[PDB]
């Protein structure tokens, strides 16, 4: 039918089956890619058409940046795991939104491990928002709804 636009979205986190509804305001989210790795096997007298053998599926890496805000249960989670205290998992629910703020489709990203966390640079010469480019690696992705 008709396509949808890419500037309404919210992403909520699930810290140990306890939802996190304070941290849904993000600047951008990376867009979710998955890829089936493929080993090409060429053989014998068949030298006019390829022959591709499937392999394991390689999921992408989810980056999402936000303006730096007051400290929140999202920020206490990344600071806990990137200071070497506790390696813990967090589930991410990324959903599109309608005009009536209803979800079109949602991606649930099970057991996403927070990998890196990077702020923007200070500079005195230009005016811009300090952002928090924080990037986390998920190990499964289960698309759910209508209008994928």
């Amino acid at each position: 039918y008709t396509p949808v636009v890419s500037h309404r979205f919210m992403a909520s986190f699930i810290f140990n089956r306890i939802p996190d509804p304070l941290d849904i305001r993000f600047q951008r989210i990376s867009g979710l890619s998955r890829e089936l790795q493929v080993t090409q096997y060429s053989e014998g007298g068949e030298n006019a058409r390829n022959n591709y053998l499937a392999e394991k599926i390689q999921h992408g890496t989810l980056t999402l940046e936000r303006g730096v805000m007051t400290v929140s249960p999202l920020t206490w989670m990344f600071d806990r795991v990137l200071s070497g205290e506790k390696i813990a998992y967090a589930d991410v629910v990324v959903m599109l939104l309608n005009e009536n703020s209803l979800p079109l489709s949602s991606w649930t990203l099970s057991n996403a491990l927070p990998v890196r966390w990077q702020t923007s640079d200070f500079d005195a010469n230009s005016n811009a928002i300090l952002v928090n480019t924080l990037e986390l690696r998920y190990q499964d992705m289960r698309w759910l709804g209508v209008k994928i």
């Binding site: 309404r8 919210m10 992403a11 849904i24 305001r25 303006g67 939104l97 703020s101």
Partner: protein, 49 residues
């Protein structure tokens, strides 16, 4: 019938009579222009809007 003391407190003031003082000197100029106070703007938009 307004007086000349109400004109000096209500009526606006015209450009054609001004004095410029450069440092400690007084130099009579013809036209001074281009002084202003400007700022740039930072926008931030996120997600839910």
């Amino acid at each position: 019938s307004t007086s000349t003391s109400q004109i000096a407190v209500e009526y606006p003031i015209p450009v054609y009579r001004f004095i410029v003082s450069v440092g400690d000197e007084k130099i009579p100029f013809n036209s001074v222009s281009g002084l202003d106070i400007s700022y740039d703007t930072i926008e931030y938009r996120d997600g839910v809007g």
